Design an enzyme around this catalytic site. Structure first.
Site, mmCIF file in Angstrom:
data_model
loop_
_atom_site.group_PDB
_atom_site.id
_atom_site.type_symbol
_atom_site.label_atom_id
_atom_site.label_comp_id
_atom_site.label_asym_id
_atom_site.label_seq_id
_atom_site.Cartn_x
_atom_site.Cartn_y
_atom_site.Cartn_z
ATOM 1 N N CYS B 46 0.853 -1.213 0.000
ATOM 2 C CA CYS B 46 0.000 0.000 0.000
ATOM 3 C C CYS B 46 0.873 1.241 0.000
ATOM 4 O O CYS B 46 2.121 1.152 -0.068
ATOM 5 C CB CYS B 46 -0.972 0.024 1.208
ATOM 6 S SG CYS B 46 -0.258 0.567 2.793
ATOM 7 N N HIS B 47 0.233 2.389 0.203
ATOM 8 C CA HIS B 47 0.931 3.696 0.205
ATOM 9 C C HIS B 47 2.027 3.764 1.204
ATOM 10 O O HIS B 47 3.058 4.377 0.961
ATOM 11 C CB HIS B 47 -0.053 4.873 0.391
ATOM 12 C CG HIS B 47 -0.936 5.058 -0.790
ATOM 13 N ND1 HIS B 47 -0.441 5.173 -2.069
ATOM 14 C CD2 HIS B 47 -2.283 5.099 -0.910
ATOM 15 C CE1 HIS B 47 -1.437 5.299 -2.931
ATOM 16 N NE2 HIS B 47 -2.570 5.249 -2.246
ATOM 17 N N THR B 48 1.894 3.029 2.294
ATOM 18 C CA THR B 48 2.935 3.126 3.298
ATOM 19 C C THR B 48 4.287 2.616 2.780
ATOM 20 O O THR B 48 5.357 3.180 3.122
ATOM 21 C CB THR B 48 2.530 2.449 4.579
ATOM 22 O OG1 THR B 48 1.383 3.120 5.012
ATOM 23 C CG2 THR B 48 3.608 2.620 5.662
ATOM 24 N N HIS B 68 4.773 -4.763 4.576
ATOM 25 C CA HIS B 68 4.260 -4.895 5.924
ATOM 26 C C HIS B 68 2.895 -5.625 5.969
ATOM 27 O O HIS B 68 2.412 -5.851 7.036
ATOM 28 C CB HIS B 68 4.240 -3.493 6.562
ATOM 29 C CG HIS B 68 3.229 -2.620 5.910
ATOM 30 N ND1 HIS B 68 3.466 -1.988 4.721
ATOM 31 C CD2 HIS B 68 1.927 -2.390 6.206
ATOM 32 C CE1 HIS B 68 2.364 -1.390 4.304
ATOM 33 N NE2 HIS B 68 1.423 -1.597 5.204
ATOM 34 N N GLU B 69 2.262 -5.960 4.836
ATOM 35 C CA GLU B 69 0.968 -6.636 4.789
ATOM 36 C C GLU B 69 1.215 -8.055 4.227
ATOM 37 O O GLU B 69 1.601 -8.183 3.060
ATOM 38 C CB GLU B 69 0.021 -5.886 3.845
ATOM 39 C CG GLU B 69 -0.309 -4.440 4.273
ATOM 40 C CD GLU B 69 -1.351 -3.811 3.372
ATOM 41 O OE1 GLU B 69 -2.151 -4.562 2.723
ATOM 42 O OE2 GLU B 69 -1.378 -2.566 3.332
ATOM 43 N N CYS B 98 2.930 -5.807 23.081
ATOM 44 C CA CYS B 98 3.806 -6.489 24.041
ATOM 45 C C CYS B 98 3.054 -6.918 25.316
ATOM 46 O O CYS B 98 3.465 -7.879 26.001
ATOM 47 C CB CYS B 98 5.043 -5.633 24.362
ATOM 48 S SG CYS B 98 4.870 -4.447 25.712
ATOM 49 N N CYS B 101 3.998 -2.906 28.617
ATOM 50 C CA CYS B 101 4.496 -1.515 28.715
ATOM 51 C C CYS B 101 3.376 -0.546 29.155
ATOM 52 O O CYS B 101 2.202 -0.902 29.174
ATOM 53 C CB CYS B 101 5.066 -1.066 27.355
ATOM 54 S SG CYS B 101 3.753 -0.625 26.169
ATOM 55 N N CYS B 104 0.413 -0.373 26.581
ATOM 56 C CA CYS B 104 -0.344 -1.624 26.515
ATOM 57 C C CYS B 104 -1.224 -1.750 27.775
ATOM 58 O O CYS B 104 -2.374 -2.154 27.698
ATOM 59 C CB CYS B 104 0.595 -2.835 26.389
ATOM 60 S SG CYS B 104 1.114 -3.187 24.677
ATOM 61 N N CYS B 112 1.960 0.519 21.135
ATOM 62 C CA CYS B 112 2.919 -0.097 22.029
ATOM 63 C C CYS B 112 4.342 0.448 21.827
ATOM 64 O O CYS B 112 4.858 0.481 20.726
ATOM 65 C CB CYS B 112 2.809 -1.622 21.804
ATOM 66 S SG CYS B 112 4.151 -2.717 22.341
ATOM 67 N N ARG B 116 10.323 -0.473 19.230
ATOM 68 C CA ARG B 116 10.402 0.546 18.231
ATOM 69 C C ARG B 116 11.808 1.029 18.058
ATOM 70 O O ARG B 116 12.101 1.608 17.038
ATOM 71 C CB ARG B 116 9.527 1.738 18.613
ATOM 72 C CG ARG B 116 8.062 1.571 18.252
ATOM 73 C CD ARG B 116 7.639 2.562 17.164
ATOM 74 N NE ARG B 116 6.389 2.166 16.510
ATOM 75 C CZ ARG B 116 5.537 2.987 15.889
ATOM 76 N NH1 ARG B 116 5.760 4.295 15.809
ATOM 77 N NH2 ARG B 116 4.432 2.482 15.349
ATOM 78 N N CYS B 176 -3.275 -4.422 8.044
ATOM 79 C CA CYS B 176 -3.190 -2.962 7.739
ATOM 80 C C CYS B 176 -4.532 -2.307 7.379
ATOM 81 O O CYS B 176 -5.261 -1.798 8.235
ATOM 82 C CB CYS B 176 -2.085 -2.690 6.680
ATOM 83 S SG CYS B 176 -1.781 -0.880 6.345
ATOM 84 N N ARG B 371 -6.279 -3.492 -3.732
ATOM 85 C CA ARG B 371 -5.111 -4.068 -3.225
ATOM 86 C C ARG B 371 -4.605 -5.093 -4.300
ATOM 87 O O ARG B 371 -5.411 -5.731 -4.985
ATOM 88 C CB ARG B 371 -5.351 -4.802 -1.893
ATOM 89 C CG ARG B 371 -5.221 -3.979 -0.596
ATOM 90 C CD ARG B 371 -3.825 -3.479 -0.344
ATOM 91 N NE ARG B 371 -3.701 -2.862 0.996
ATOM 92 C CZ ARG B 371 -4.025 -1.602 1.288
ATOM 93 N NH1 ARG B 371 -4.434 -0.755 0.336
ATOM 94 N NH2 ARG B 371 -3.870 -1.162 2.534
#
Ligand SMILES: NC(=O)c1ccc[n+]([C@@H]2O[C@H](COP(=O)([O-])OP(=O)(O)OC[C@H]3O[C@@H](n4cnc5c(N)ncnc54)[C@H](O)[C@@H]3O)[C@@H](O)[C@H]2O)c1
Ligand SMILES: NC(=O)c1ccc[n+]([C@@H]2O[C@H](COP(=O)([O-])OP(=O)(O)OC[C@H]3O[C@@H](n4cnc5c(N)ncnc54)[C@H](O)[C@@H]3O)[C@@H](O)[C@H]2O)c1
Ligand SMILES: [Zn+2]
Ligand SMILES: [Zn+2]
Ligand SMILES: [Zn+2]
Ligand SMILES: [Zn+2]
Lengths: 378, 378
Positions: B46-48, B68-69, B98, B101, B104, B112, B116, B176, B371
């Site tokens: 996708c656009h991301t 990422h998908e 997670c 944290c 979460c 979360c 990162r 996503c 998609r």
């Protein structure tokens, strides 16, 4: 006995922007259908009146009788009127509650659009004319209230009937700033016990937000003002930390985030400054912080932020009269004050007369001043 | 038996911005502690992904494997890993969960902190190195997922375990776009039965918002797009009125207010355009209307409006991943899909191979395209 008769009383008239009000004799016509003539005993003033007096309000019409925070006693009612009668004690409200329009029935807002077409242009619904004149020439109403006068005529949908023992020289503040602040907390934000709050601007409204937050159980109540002397007064109303933007090079939002290890749970902007409105949003915690705009911006001013502020879980809101329904809940707020559960008296720093209304305007810029209450008999 | 070994497999590598991705053999190291190596069978885009590929992120790291998908089958896991094991069917999620944290544990958000610091700079937490390389040169991970590969290695807190019978070439969407749109409705806005909604952007996300809204009971589901061909497809997803802004001289927000006699109860911005984000807010009904910025979004650009819009009762919000907790709820979404309660198949307009990834990129800009799903074995 005045019923059905024109009445000649004193009122403070504003003929020109930014010039002194002059206290004239005026003719107050009697109430038509749906209308309510009130003997105003005490009126306060706030920024809202001066915004229009200063000439900056593009809705302003001159000449006009300003004023929207008052308490008095009903002199007479026009035909149709049943919720109030001669001799009831009342607080006229700039926000109607007709209980009959889309808005009132929605169950989802306190805004009511019933009379605003007429009150926005300084007249009455029934005949789209003013009830005020001097020497045969009309004087415009203001906000549906026009309380800088010993008598006014208002719509019956804007009249809150209150406890007849309540002190009229205190409950006059319950038509504007105090319910705005309290209700920003209790109705608009719905601040839970243990929340951290930031409050931008520590005048009457901000101080009412602080009392609201304190009453609702907030933990940190952080006040922000450009005048550091404001803090000492503010501690009584419940402000328990303080930051003057001028003491920091960083944007105030970043200071607040640093101080709170991520941001506050709720912020409230009580000034009217669009930059600060942005800051009040950006100092809220990621994930769940909410900012409520209480301050009223000048015409044409815009708020901005970056959309990631909202995408990462901050919420941007605002409030009109604290989300209170005027006719229904202003009496309730009078009860709470009579029962010593909210403050009102502490917001009053000056007691003057209507004759001295121009003084009262100057006091709008004393840093130590809050509300001035005016006795209309002199 | 591939456990314990470096695997050599096909992956699409972005060496620098804007150049066509290169389908190379790459080496994928074994999983270390807290890690899961996945055999990706199907990946969409996708656009991301395009955002970083095109260089629109001045910080983007090259060389890297995007994507990422996706959905696939766990090939092995590292030390200390309990929630999945080899053979499990999974969806790697760019949003970690997670459960341990500050964020979460708050219950007041889905975002979360945990991993990162490594994923944000294309590496793994365990040793701060990448599991990918070509001829011994490191290739960075992306978004913690790197699904443009036959195999990837991810952190265990980013792995959702799903129904092993679900078609992998369909559920690869549920990491996503589709959850973001559905959740925007059900979690962020909490749309009630009878609500009137406006949806700005009828691509995958907007269509997901429409299904969300239909499922929730909304009445008017008004779609706005600049490409009038998009409505025909949108009807099946639940959009039942359509406006193209190009057909109107007035700004679209005013068109939508007129169309709904005051505005919508909820609006959703599904594009990423700050000017339309403003329009979505401004077409909300006085008093209670809410606008959700659907999607991250976006860069540098500011949103604006006049604070009166919020003072008079509109609310501005946004969402990441539709308010869904990835690990707990993506398997729930797969359940709903398997029980015919949400659509997935209808978002897919192209089935291509990993060999044809650059063609899939071009399709991101084709009007009739939604998609594309890429079979990684070719
Ligand atoms: N939403 C509503 O229904 C409603 C109702 C009543 C009043 N109001 C608004 O609330 C606002 C406050 O009125 P008030 O009577 O308390 O005013 P005020 O003048 O008594 O207080 C304003 C305060 O803001 C401070 N201030 C000014 N600039 C600042 C800055 N840049 N950063 C931090 N502090 C700053 C001043 O020092 C002062 O303490 C006004 O905009 C008024 O229009 C809104
Ligand atoms: N966590 C998250 O919030 C999250 C998750 C997934 C995607 N997203 C975002 O949501 C957005 C949508 O991705 P998509 O895959 O649906 O994209 P898409 O390209 O399939 O659709 C975008 C649509 O908007 C339409 N459009 C463009 N400009 C317009 C305008 N000015 N007025 C009306 N319509 C307009 C285009 O015609 C197109 O149909 C992207 O911004 C993506 O960045 C966010
Ligand atoms: Zn006031
Ligand atoms: Zn009403
Ligand atoms: Zn995506
Ligand atoms: Zn976490």
């Amino acid at each position: 006995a005045t019923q059905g008769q024109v009445i000649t009383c004193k009122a403070a008239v504003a003929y020109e922007p930014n010039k002194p009000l002059v206290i004239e004799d005026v003719q107050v016509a009697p109430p038509q259908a749906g209308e309510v003539r009130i003997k105003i005993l005490y009126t306060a003033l706030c920024h809202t009146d001066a915004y229009t007096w200063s000439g900056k309000d593009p809705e302003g019409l001159f000449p006009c009788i300003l004023g929207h925070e008052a308490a008095g006693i009903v002199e007479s009612v026009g035909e149709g009127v049943t919720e109030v009668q001669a001799g009831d004690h009342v607080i006229p409200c700039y926000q109607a509650e007709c209980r009959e329009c889309k808005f009132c029935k929605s169950g989802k807002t306190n805004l009511c659009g019933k009379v605003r077409s007429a009150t926005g242009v300084g007249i009455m619904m029934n005949d789209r004319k003013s009830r005020f004149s001097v020497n045969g020439k009309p004087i415009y109403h203001f906000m549906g209230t026009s309380t800088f006068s010993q008598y006014t005529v208002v719509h019956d949908v804007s009249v809150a009937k209150i406890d007849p023992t309540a002190p009229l020289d205190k409950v006059c503040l319950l038509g504007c700033g105090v319910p705005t602040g309290l209700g920003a907390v209790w109705n608009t934000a719905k601040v839970e016990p243990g929340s951290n709050v930031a409050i931008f601007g520590l005048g009457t409204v901000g101080l009412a937000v602080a009392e609201g937050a304190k009453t609702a159980g907030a933990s940190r109540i952080i006040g922000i003002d450009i005048d550091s002397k404001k803090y000492e007064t503010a501690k009584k109303f419940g402000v328990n930390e303080f930051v003057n933007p001028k003491d920091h090079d960083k944007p105030i939002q970043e200071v607040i985030v640093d101080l709170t290890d991520g941001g506050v749970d709720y912020s409230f902007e009580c000034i009217g400054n669009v930059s600060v409105m942005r800051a009040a949003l950006e100092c809220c915690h990621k994930g769940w912080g909410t900012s409520v705009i209480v301050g009223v911006a000048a015409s044409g001013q815009e708020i901005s932020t970056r959309p990631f502020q909202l995408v990462t879980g901050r919420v941007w809101k605002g409030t009109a009269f604290g989300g209170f329904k005027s006719r229904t809940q202003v009496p309730w707020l009078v009860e709470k004050y009579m029962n010593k559960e909210i403050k009102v008296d502490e917001y009053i720093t000056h007691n003057l007369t209507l004759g001295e209304i121009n003084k009262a305007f100057d006091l709008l810029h004393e840093g130590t001043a809050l509300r001035a209450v005016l006795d209309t008999s002199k």
